[PDB]
Design a protein around this ligand. Structure first.
Ligand SMILES: [Mg+2]
Lengths: 161, 195, 132, 99, 101, 120, 122, 86
């Protein structure tokens, strides 16, 4: 009599490819990263590089001025709550702790301060979020710090090597 | 400093696809549109504005992205996510005899990032009582317990349910209320003899 | 003598455009509205906040660009979209223009919590329609 | 309206979720106020005046860093500078009437 | 930088009424009750009278968020009568057109 | 794991592609998380902490330190019926109000004892 | 999991002018005829709100300025549509929904009989 | 060249362009190959899909395009090419 077929479960990929990814490519089309007005069209590679670098510098200075005053970008009005609308934090959140404070100071003049705090509060530096951060930031200092951590603490050897 | 670049009017061709130029609802950029359309109130002896710097063409939303061939291609590409309607539910009589329970929904829209709507919580349950197993005393007791929430002409039970922010909870609550109504109709209490 | 947002005629050396040379009794006739959203219709909430956001955006765009706006702003509130339809004169470098566009887009998207894409319209000079 | 009608009304109130036993009119205020949102917690009552202090501080810090060209504040500063240069400036902290 | 004081007092009173709301709701619920002895109603009235002022929804004054006008303010867009006509003649309110019948 | 983060950044900077039209723009906006979910609804986010209907309607399992026949029970049933038909507050706030009223009635016991009735 | 089959549903579209909503409903009926929905066309009555306000700031009561609020109504009537087809139609409507109109989705799903409706004894 | 064009951005635009200078060099090489391999139709298609979609040309690629246009009688759009090269 009345048949009941099973429903299809599609997320944000099937409908996207069925709607947007079902057209052709324009012939004389400039890259859509910029604008479309005739006076601001990229005529060569130099103009495109300059516009891209200007956009990157604008984004960087915007993020910098947002991180400088975090108390002006917190009153949300949206509902789905986009996770990419919250600035990152770089100041430590633990004072009386040792390993947790060192990790918060390293991950979240920062690496040296974290190393000094770990040496003062007697905190064993692990092989994750410590040696790699010291090698990426600072390379005789990183080697000296690794040697000091290996001489003062004997945990994992393969990861340290 | 100062420079000059030719627009896309004399740069494109004639045998070119249209939706490939204006995919999304663009606010009409006088550049890739080779249509010198003039809109505005002119003067007695003069020429009105054309397309460049025209505020009327910028405020009014343009409908150049819904090309007929593009609409046909979009409707054809979405055939994979469709379900054919069964032939057993073509007439309304068979639909009412098979599925006599209707559940309405309230989904509106708001301008801005706000998604919550205080008027999107009502879900009226319309069930036709002409197909259920209702005798005489049970049906009379059900009508007495309902009161005015039952139509005496179309015979469609209309009960308004809105006691939670969600909708499936209200649906389950209405189903439970209907279940208790059907249970109490088959029961006789001590004060029913003194009717 | 009831004078509104119109331009007073004096002699013959005031290059006015189409927005400043119209009376408010011709908006729904020979003009129109700058913005457009569903908050003004009957039966819908969230309107005062939208007007405050619009006036704040207009003040910000007028203060950041010194005289770069030849007319006004044409905003479009489509669900979760804030499209800016402004005009910029051809008096500066395109690199600075793109820098300002990117900065404004980032600031608006990080402040109003809404994806914003700007669309500029280069005008070689100031907009003009009559010499009223 | 007799005993049977009263029993049916109490049964309907208990089923749909109302007041079963009979009450007065002043006692209905509690239920009619708990069944809705109070005036002091409406979505448009406390949000009538947004935090304008934050917007003012943002405009001030954008004008200070040169990211915002506020002509009104510049005109005010120019007028204050002209008034101070004319010979009528603001007195110090704790000087004026007793000077 | 602001220049007015009545707007600041009004927003402070609004914030204090939003903070002090559950207690006032409970007191008002204990008030309007034909049942329950009068001593509880009397002590509730004494407690709600002993509370400091500037924290009550009664003192809420619907003013404008641009001019802070006391009387003559719409409750829709939260503004006075002159700013409304001003921004309507400028052209920001879509649909709000001059009545021509 | 900083090495995994560096590997992900390398994959991202290798598999990069410029923009062509507005379709890629909206695709990027949807993948970034800026647009709403499609068939926009009214229950995305605020789901009342994943509760059902028995926790909103049946509130008898929250009244234990109260009698069965009396004015106190009448007031408790009244406030329960008021909290039941309230789609603006959550069940946690209802339980908080119930326990606050319970503590308030248990604190002032002299008046309840002098009211020619007992309080349970 | 079984699919949810719908019977009748309407998408009320209310805007400011008339040409935009006319073109939108024309596109909608074209998309419906090019897929297999078979709908009709109707127009509910309109509602215009007018209020009277002052013109100046002092003693100027004899000169008043009024404003209007045009809000038309254009709703369709989608019939004989399943769940996936209704979802696809709603997606197509939302992907091209202008900023000057609204949307009121009122779907009516189908349901046979619950678990306790036959002969249940608590 | 056909395999590179098919594996570039025809399926997944990932290994098509790593930066800017390499992408410009690859586009110039593809244009020179299309101009020195087939006749004039493929050269015009490459100039419309590369020189008009990416950026302007360099010196050797521009000289090769000019030679291919002169060898097939196509001297009409030399001013725009000269302006782009300048
Ligand atoms: Mg007059």
């Amino acid at each position: 009599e009345v048949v009941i077929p099973k429903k299809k479960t599609w997320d944000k990929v099937a409908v996207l490819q069925a709607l947007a990814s079902t057209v052709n490519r324009d012939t004389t089309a400039v890259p859509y990263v910029f604008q479309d007005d005739p006076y601001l069209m990229p005529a060569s590679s130099l103009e495109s590089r300059s516009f891209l670098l200007a956009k990157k510098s604008g984004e960087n200075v915007a993020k910098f001025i947002i991180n400088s005053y975090p108390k002006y970008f917190q009153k949300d009005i949206a509902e789905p709550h986009i996770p990419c609308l919250m600035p990152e934090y770089f100041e430590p959140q633990i004072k009386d702790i040792s390993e947790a404070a060192l990790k918060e100071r390293i991950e979240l003049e920062p690496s040296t301060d974290y190393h000094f705090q770990q040496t003062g509060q007697s905190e064993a530096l692990e092989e994750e979020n410590d040696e790699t951060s010291r090698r990426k930031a600072g390379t005789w200092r990183a080697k000296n710090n690794a040697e000091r951590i290996f001489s003062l603490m004997p945990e994992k050897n393969e990861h340290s090597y | 400093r100062r420079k000059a670049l030719p627009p896309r009017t004399e740069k494109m061709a004639v045998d070119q696809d249209w939706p490939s130029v204006y995919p999304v609802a663009a606010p009409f950029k006088p550049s890739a549109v080779p249509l010198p359309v003039r809109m505005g109130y002119p003067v007695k002896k003069g020429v009105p504005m054309a397309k460049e710097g025209n505020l009327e063409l910028l405020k009014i939303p343009n409908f150049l992205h819904l090309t007929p061939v593009a609409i046909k291609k979009h409707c054809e590409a979405l055939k994979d996510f469709c379900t054919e309607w069964p032939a057993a539910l073509d007439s309304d009589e068979k639909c009412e005899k098979h599925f006599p329970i209707e559940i309405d929904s309230t989904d509106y829209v708001s301008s801005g990032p706000s998604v919550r709507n205080p008027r999107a919580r009502v879900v009226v349950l319309r069930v036709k009582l002409s197909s259920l197993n209702l005798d005489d005393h049970a049906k009379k007791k059900l009508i007495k317990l309902v009161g005015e929430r039952y139509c005496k002409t179309t015979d469609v039970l209309t009960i308004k349910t809105d006691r939670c922010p969600l909708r499936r909870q209200n649906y389950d609550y209405a189903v439970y209320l209907l279940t208790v109504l059907y249970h109490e109709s088959w029961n006789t209490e001590e004060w029913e003899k003194s009717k | 003598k009831n004078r509104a947002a119109r331009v007073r005629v004096s002699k013959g050396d005031k290059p006015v455009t189409y927005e400043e040379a119209h009376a408010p009794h011709y908006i729904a006739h020979r003009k129109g509205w700058l913005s457009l959203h569903t908050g003004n219709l009957d039966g819908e909430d969230h309107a005062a906040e939208r007007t405050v956001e619009d006036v704040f955006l207009r003040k910000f765009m007028w203060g950041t660009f010194p005289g770069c706006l030849a007319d006004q702003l044409v905003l479009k509130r489509r669900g979760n979209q804030l499209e800016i339809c402004a005009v910029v004169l051809r008096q500066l470098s395109p690199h600075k223009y793109y820098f300002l566009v990117g900065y404004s887009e980032t600031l608006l998207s990080y402040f109003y919590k809404c994806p914003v894409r700007l669309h500029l319209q280069t005008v070689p000079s100031k907009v003009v329609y009559k010499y009223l | 309206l007799s005993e049977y009608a009263f029993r049916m009304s109490r049964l309907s109130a208990r089923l749909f979720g109302e007041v079963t036993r009979p009450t007065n009119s002043k006692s209905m205020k509690v239920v009619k106020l708990f069944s809705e949102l109070p005036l002091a917690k409406k979505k448009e009552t406390y949000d009538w005046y947004p935090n304008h202090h934050t917007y003012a501080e943002l405009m001030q810090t954008l004008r200070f860093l040169g990211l915002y060209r506020d002509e009104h504040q510049d005109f005010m500063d120019e007028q204050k500078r002209l008034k101070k240069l004319r010979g009528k400036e603001k007195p110090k902290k704790g000087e004026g009437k007793r000077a | 930088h602001y220049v007015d004081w009545r707007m600041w007092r009004d927003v402070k009173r609004r914030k204090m009424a939003y903070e002090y709301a559950d207690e006032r709701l409970r007191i008002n619920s204990l008030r309007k009750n034909t049942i329950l002895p009068k001593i509880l109603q009397d002590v509730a009235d004494e407690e709600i009278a002993a509370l400091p002022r500037d924290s009550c929804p009664v003192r809420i004054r619907n003013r404008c968020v641009m001019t802070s006008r006391p009387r003559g303010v719409k409750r829709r867009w939260r503004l006075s009568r002159i700013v409304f006509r001003h921004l309507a003649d400028h052209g920001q309110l879509s649909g709000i057109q001059r009545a021509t019948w | 794991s900083l090495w995994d983060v560096e590997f992900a950044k390398q994959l991202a900077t290798v598999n990069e592609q410029p923009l062509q039209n507005g379709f890629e723009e909206l695709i990027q906006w949807t993948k970034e998380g800026k647009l709403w979910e499609f068939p926009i609804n009214n229950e995305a986010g605020f789901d009342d902490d994943g509760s059902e209907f028995h926790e909103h309607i049946f509130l008898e399992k929250h009244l234990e330190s109260f009698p069965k026949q009396g004015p106190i029970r009448h007031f408790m049933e009244l406030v329960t019926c008021g909290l039941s038909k309230n789609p603006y507050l959550s069940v946690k706030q209802k339980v908080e109000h119930i326990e606050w009223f319970r503590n308030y009635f248990n604190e002032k016991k002299d008046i309840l004892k002098e009211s020619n009735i007992q309080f349970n | 999991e079984p699919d949810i089959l719908y019977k009748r549903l309407s998408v009320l579209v209310k805007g400011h002018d008339k040409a935009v909503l006319d073109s939108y409903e024309y596109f909608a009926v074209l998309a419906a005829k090019e897929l297999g929905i078979s709908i009709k066309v109707h127009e509910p009555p309109r509602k215009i709100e007018r209020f009277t306000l002052l013109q100046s700031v002092h003693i100027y009561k004899k000169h008043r300025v009024q404003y209007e609020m045009r809000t038309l109504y254009r709703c369709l009537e989608l019939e004989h549509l399943t769940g996936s087809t209704a979802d696809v139609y709603l997606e197509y409507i939302q992907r091209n929904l202008p900023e000057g109109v609204a949307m009121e989705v009122t779907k009516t799903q189908l349901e046979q009989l619950p678990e306790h409706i036959k002969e249940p004894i608590w | 060249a056909y395999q590179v064009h098919g594996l570039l951005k025809t399926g997944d635009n990932w290994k098509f362009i790593g930066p800017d200078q390499h992408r410009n060099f690859y586009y110039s090489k593809f244009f020179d190959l299309i101009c020195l391999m087939e006749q004039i139709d493929v050269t015009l298609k490459w100039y419309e899909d590369l020189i008009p979609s990416a950026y302007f040309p360099h010196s050797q690629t521009m000289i090769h395009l000019l030679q291919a246009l002169d060898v097939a009688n196509r001297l009409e759009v030399i001013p725009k090419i000269w302006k782009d090269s300048k």
